[model samples]
Target: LHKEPATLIKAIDGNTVKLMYKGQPMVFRLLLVDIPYGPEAAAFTKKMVENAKKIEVEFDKGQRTDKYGRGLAYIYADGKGVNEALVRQGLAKVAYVYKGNNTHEQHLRKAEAQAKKEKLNIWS
Candidate 1:
C-alpha cells in the first residue's frame, strides 16, 4: 500500500477527513468503517486526528473513489490505523465490503471481534 504521509487540514465526522497532501487538499472518505453513534463517534476521530503528529492515508489499491468521488482510503494518524481503532474502540463497524477496494478486511474484523468480546463503547 502507498502511504501518503501528509498533514491534517480538517477531520470531520468519523468517516471523513480533509487533509493536505502534496500541495493539495484531499477529502478522504474512510473506506468501510461506518459511524454508528451519530455525533458520538465523530468526537473520537476528531480528538485522535487533529492531535496526531502526522497524518497518512493509503488510497485503496483498487477503485479509489466512490460515485461521489472522495478519496476512498485507509487512515493512519501518527501511523495508527484510525479505521481499526474506531472498530476496536467500539465506535464503528466494518460497514460493507467491496470486492476490489480497501484491503484491511481480516485485520479490521479481528479488532471488531476483540472489541465485541471486551464490550467497548458501542458494544457496552
Candidate 2:
C-alpha cells in the first residue's frame, strides 16, 4: 500500500507491534527474535518501541496480511532489520505461522531448535 517500509510502529508487547498504515491497525510479528522473560523483557519492549518510532516497513508481497487483516512485513528500522535483529539478540523467535510465509520459517525453526537443545528458556 503506498506506505514507507518503516512506517510500522511497535506497540507495547513482548514481541508484537501495530502499524499505522492505511487507517488500519495492523499487527506484525517480529521475526528471528527471542528474549527470555524477565524484567529485561520490559526493557526489550521499550527498545522495540524506540526502534519502531524511527523508520519505514516493507511487505513480503507473498503474504501481505495476516489472518487478523493486519499487514505482515519484515520490518526494517534504523539499520537494524527487525527480523534478523530479533533472533540475533534472542528477543523474538522466528514465529511459527502454522500456515505460510514462514519466510524466516527455517530461521525461527533453528532458533527454537537450538533453544530446545540448550534449554535456554526452560523454567527452573
Candidate 3:
C-alpha cells in the first residue's frame, strides 16, 4: 500500500500520467477506463492537474503495475478523483472496469451509467 501527495509532471494519456511522487518522477496509470476519447480525457486531466494545488497518487496492493509495468494508481487532483471524472465525463468507456481488476470499479460503473444517459462523449 503506497499513497502520497504528488505533483503532476505531465499527462501521458487519458489514463496515464507522469507524477513526481516521493521525489521520484514515475508514470502512473489511472485505475480504470482505457479511455475511448483519450485525447480529451488526457487533455482535461492535464488541465485539472495543472490547476490544482496538489495531486495525490496511490497504488493498489494486489498488483502495482500491469504486464507493461505502468504503475496502476488512483489520482486525486485538488480533491478531484480523476478515475471517476474520466468516466463521468464520458471520455471513457467501462469494459475492464474491474471486470478485469480495474483499480476503481464501482465509481466508474455508477458514474458511467449516468454519463451514458447524457451521451457525453463516446456514449454519443
Candidate 4:
C-alpha cells in the first residue's frame, strides 16, 4: 500500500481473507491455525494477539505471490511470523509444510516446541 492502498476483494471465511492491490488479488493466511486442543494459558494467548498485530503492519514487504497471481507474504509482528503467532499464543501446533519461502522456519519450529512442551492444544 505504498503507491496505492490495498482494497478488500473478497473474504472466503474469517480465516481466509482476500484483498486487491493495483488490480492484483492478494490472499492472506489468517492469524488462526489448527489446534485440536485449546489454549494453554492466558499469557500465551495474549502473546499471539500481540504477534498478529505486528504482522499486519508489514507483511506485503516479504512479497510472496500465489499461483492465482495473488500476493502471499509473511506477516511479521514484534519480530515474529504470523505462522508462529499461533504457537506463541498456544493456539496451534506445527503442521508440516512442503514448500515455502520459510526463512523463519527455525523460529517457527522453536515456537512449536514451546507449545508442545507447555502442553497447549494437545489432542489426546
Q: lDDT value for candidate 2?
A: 0.55
- Model 1, runs deviating above 4 Å: none
| Separate clash counts for every candidate | 0, 19, 0, 3
The most accurate candidate by TM-score is 1
Best by lDDT: 1
The number of residue pairs in model 1 that clash at the backbone is: 0
lDDT of 2 by residue, 1-124 (tens): 2226445454555556676665655677554344455454446655765755465566553666657775566666664555554554454455556345556667656655565565553321
The C-alpha stretches of model 3 lying farther than 4 A from their native spots are 1-3, 95-103
Local distance difference test scores for all models: 0.85, 0.55, 0.78, 0.48
* Residue lDDT tens for model 1, 17-108: 88887788878888879876757779989998989998888977688877776788899988898988989889998878764774897889
Clashing pairs in 1: none
Model 2 regions more than 4 Å off: 1-3, 6-10, 22-25, 31-42, 51-53, 97-100, 104-124
Q: Point out the higher-scoring one by TM-score: 1 or 3.
A: 1
TM-score for each model: 0.92, 0.59, 0.87, 0.50
- Steric clash pairs (candidate 4): 54-77, 55-77, 64-72
Could you give candidate 3's per-residue lDDT for residues 27-60 as a string of tens digits? Answer: 8878866665667887978887888898998775
